[PDB]
Amino acid sequence: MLKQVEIFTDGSCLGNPGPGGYGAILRYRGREKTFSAGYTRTTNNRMELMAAIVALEALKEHCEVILSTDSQYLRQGITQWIHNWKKRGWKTADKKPVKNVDLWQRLDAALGQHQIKWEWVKGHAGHPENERCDELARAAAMNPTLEDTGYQVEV
Q1: What are the strands, taking DSSP E only, across 50-138?
Q2: Any idea which positions bind Mg(2+) 1?
Q3: Is the peptide bond before 128 cis (omega within 30 degrees of 0)?
């Protein structure tokens, strides 16, 4: 039985916007859960956040997590922006809401329930589970079934 929860995420999009999807692998309890869905019109950044979100929302108790991903958007959010965004009320310097505020707030809610250890992998040097997320993400985007409600060309 693993002593820490292991999560792997990937997200993919064919256009901007275009159809996209995500793949997340979750090692929780004695199982490996696999999550993946395609969206008719979204963006690569929105899918990368969705991967992380659906994985964490599955955890039903406070856990010790190790989340592994090569997603740069997630990385920059987590390491440079999120902190300052909470202090500023989720607004940009020109007082508009941040881009993808729907997802980042959603994600933030999921992250505050756990002790998280982030492992930023290089795209060409992750683990087998990262490669498999990539494969899932791509397959999903080719057969999109859901609508990405928070997507805006806009705000």
Answers
A1: 64-69, 115-120
A2: 10, 48, 70
A3: no
**108 among annotated binding-site residues:** no
Resolution in A: 1.8
Catalytic center residues: 10-11, 48, 70, 124, 134
Instruction: Please give the Cα distance from 143 to 155 (Å, whole number).
Output: 27
How long, in residues, is the chain? 155
**Secondary structure class of 88 (helix, strand, coil):** coil
For residues 81 and 88, the answer to whether their CB atoms sit within 8 Å is no
What is the rounded CA–CA span in Å between residue 23 and residue 85? 27
Q: Can you tell me the distance from the alpha carbon of 74 to that of 82, in angstroms, rounded to the nearest whole number?
A: 10
48 is annotated as contributing to ligand binding: yes
Which residues lie across from 144 on neighbouring strands? none
Q: Which domains does the chain have, with CATH numbers?
A: 1-155 (3.30.420.10)
Q: Is 70 annotated as a binding residue?
A: yes
Output DSSP code: residue 96: P
**Among the listed residues 58, 37, 8, 17, the one whose alpha carbon sits nearest the alpha carbon of residue 150:** 17
Method of elucidation: X-ray
CB 69 within 8 A of CB 52: yes
79: exposed, middle or buried (Cβ count in 10 Å: 0-12, 13-18, 19+): exposed
